[PDB]
Symmetry: C4
Subunit: 206 residues, 4 copies
C-alpha cells in the first residue's frame, strides 16, 4: 500500500489495456485513490516509456506534484472519486466500440445479462462537454451516481471499481457489450432486450 | 488418464481460448468427464492465476470438493454429460459473434458446409433462462440431443466433443460460422443457404 | 530445390497463414509443384504438430505416398497446376471475409487498384460443388484460366503464384479486398468501382 | 541526425505499423526529410527483410541512389515535403478502414474531437489518379495544404508530421476515426457531428 507498488500497478494496467485492444495511441488515463487525492498517469508520455517516477500525485485540492504534468483529463478522475466513495480506481479510454456508441448518443440497454456488472439495466451516455472542463466533470459525477461505468458522448468510456484489476475488467466487459450492441443494431433496431424483472434477478445473484 | 494431467489440459484449453479471441475476462468455463462426475474450472479466479489445485471435482450427485467453489454454471455442464453420453469435454464461452447471434435469437442455418461439424444443418439457439438454474439446464439438454453445439439466447455458446482439443476446435468453428452469418445478414436477409440434400452429402463424407 | 526444404517452406506458410488471421482451425491446405506432381499438407493433423515427414507427395497420376493421407481437397490443387502451368504454389483457406463474399456468390469488382494483382478487373466466385469432387475441380480450373485467385461459393479461397511467398501474399491481399468490399457494401450498393480503362493502366504498370 | 540512425527509425516504423494492423503485405512506404531530399523505403522488399543499406536516398531533384529502386510512390512523398515545410516524416499505408472510406469518396467529418489532430474539422479525401503519377502528387499537395493527413480515393492514407513517431501516431488515430465513421454510418446516415464552434475550442486547447 505504498506509492511505488501502486504506480507499478497503474503502469501494468496501461500496458494490459493496450494488450486487450482497449487503448490505442496516447488516449487512455488510469488513476488510483491515494492518501487525500490520487495517483494518475502523466500527460503526453507514451505508455511504453512510462516509469514509476512518471506517475503524478494530485492532492484533494487539485494541486499536482512539482515538475510533472498530470493527464489533461484529471478533473473527471477527481469527480469520480468524490461522486463514488467506494471507487478506488478509475480507467478511462477511447475504446472503439464504446466510442462508436457514444457518437450515436445511445445508452447500452440490457441486451445481455452481464450489463448488471455496472450496477443496473443500462450503461448510460453522458452528454458532450469539452475535455478537461468542469462542465464535463459534472456530467460524469451525475452519470456515475448509480452506475460504475458510463459512456461519454463523442469521446469514450469511464469505468470505476474497488481496485485496478476489477476496473480494467469492467472496462473490457463494457467494450464487449458495446460491440454486441453495434453488431446487432446493424441488423435490427431496436435490439431485443432482457426485461427489468430478469435483470433484477441477475443483480441479486451477483 | 489421471487428475493432474486432465487439470493441466483444462487450464491449457482456457489459455488457448483466450489466445483465439473466444474468451474475454472471466467469462468461460471448461470441464472434462471424470470418474463419476467431472473436473471443472472454479468460479472467480482469472484464467492466468489458475493452477492444477484450483480445478474442482464435482461428483455425479452434484457434491463438490471441500474448500473450492465450482464455476457458477456447472449445472449445464452436468446436463450436457447426462444428455450426451459420447461427450467427454464441454467448452462454454461468451464469444462475441456467437453471443450477438444469440441476442437476435436466431439459429445459424447452413450458410457454409462446415456447419455439419456440429451434427446437422443448423446451430440451434436455446431459449433464455437465468444462468445457473435448472430451467437453463433443461433447455441445454434438449438442444444438445441432436447437435454438439448450441447458442444460448442472450448469453453465449456451449460446445461438446470427445476430448478438449476437439471441443475447442468446434467452439472456434461455430464462432467463425456466427461471424460469417452476421457479416452476410447485414448485407442481405435472408442469407443464401445450402440445401438439406447438399448437407446430407457433406455429413456422409465427414 | 530438394524435398526437405520445400516441406519446411510449406509448414512455414501454414504457420504464417495462421499468424495473419487467414486460417483458423484445420481449414487450410498448401501445396507446391514438385517433380511430376506435388507436395501437399496431410489431412487432419493440426498445423502446429506438423513435421517435415508429414508432408505428402502425390504424383501426376494422383497416386499418393504409402502410409500418409493427403489433404481431402488435393484434387483442386492438381487442377490448378494443370490449368496454370506458371503456378508453382497453391494456398487454400477459408478466410472469413473471402468466405462471406463467397456466400453472397458475388465476384469482387475493382473497388481498389490492387485487384490487378490477381490478373484482371475482378476476383471471380466459382459455383458451389461438394468438396473433394471432380465437379469442384472443373469449376476451379475454369475460374483460374485468366485469374490467379478465385473465391469458391459457400467455401473459401484459392490463390496460386510462382512460389509460396507470393501465393501467401496474394491470398492475404484478396482477404483485404474482400473486407473492403463487405465494409462498403453494408453502407452502399453498388460500391463505386474503377473503370476498365483505369484498371488497364494499372495492369501495364505492374 | 546521421543516416544510419534515421534508416533504423524508418525500419522500426515499418515494423510497428505492421504490429498495429495498419500495414499488410508490402503496401506501406515511409520516408524522412534528409539533407536536400529524403530517405525512403525501397520498392518490393518485404518489411522484415529490410536492412539499413536497403533505405534509399533521393535528392531534391528526384535523382535516386545508384543500385537501389525507391518506393514506386516516392513522388507524393516529395510533394508532401514541398507542400508542407514543417513536415519531416511521411507515412503512407493502405489501412483497411481508411481505405474503405476512400472507396466511398467521403471526407471524415468531426464525429470525435480527436479529428483536430490533423489540423481542422475534417480528414479530406483527394480524388483518384494512378499511383506514381504527377497528377496524384498534385492532388496530395493540395489536400495537405491545411491538413496533416488525407485519404486518397480508391487507395489509402497519407499522414505527415514533425518526426516518425508523431507521423505514425497520427496515421493510427486516423484509422481509428475511419473505423468509428464506418461503424456508425452502417447504423445511421448522416452521423452526428460536433459543431465548428466546438472544434474551434478543441483546436485552441491542443
Ligand atoms: Zn478522453
Ligand atoms: Zn455463461
Ligand atoms: Zn476448403
Ligand atoms: Zn499506396
Amino acid at each position: 500500500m505504498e506509492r511505488n507498488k501502486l504506480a507499478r500497478q497503474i503502469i501494468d494496467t496501461c500496458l494490459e489495456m493496450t494488450r486487450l485492444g482497449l487503448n490505442q495511441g496516447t488516449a487512455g488515463n488510469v488513476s488510483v485513490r491515494y492518501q487525500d487525492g490520487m495517483l494518475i498517469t502523466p500527460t503526453g508520455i507514451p505508455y511504453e516509456k512510462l516509469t514509476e517516477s512518471h506517475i503524478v500525485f494530485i492532492d484533494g485540492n487539485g494541486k499536482h506534484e512539482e515538475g510533472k504534468l498530470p493527464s489533461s483529463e484529471w478533473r473527471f478522475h477527481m469527480a469520480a472519486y468524490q461522486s463514488r466513495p467506494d471507487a478506488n480506481a478509475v480507467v478511462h479510454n477511447h475504446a472503439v466500440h464504446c466510442t462508436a456508441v457514444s457518437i450515436l448518443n445511445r445508452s447500452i440497454p440490457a441486451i445481455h445479462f452481464m450489463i448488471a456488472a455496472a450496477g443496473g439495466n443500462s450503461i448510460p451516455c453522458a452528454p458532450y462537454a469539452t475535455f478537461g472542463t468542469r462542465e464535463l466533470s459534472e456530467h460524469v459525477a451525475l452519470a456515475l451516481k448509480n452506475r460504475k461505468a458510463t459512456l461519454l458522448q463523442h469521446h469514450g468510456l469511464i469505468a470505476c471499481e474497488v481496485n485496478l484489476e476489477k476496473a480494467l475488467w469492467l472496462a473490457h466487459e463494457v467494450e464487449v457489450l458495446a460491440q454486441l450492441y453495434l453488431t446487432t443494431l446493424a441488423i435490427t433496431d431496436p435490439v431485443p432486450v432482457l426485461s427489468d424483472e430478469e435483470i433484477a434477478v441477475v443483480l441479486e445473484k451477483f
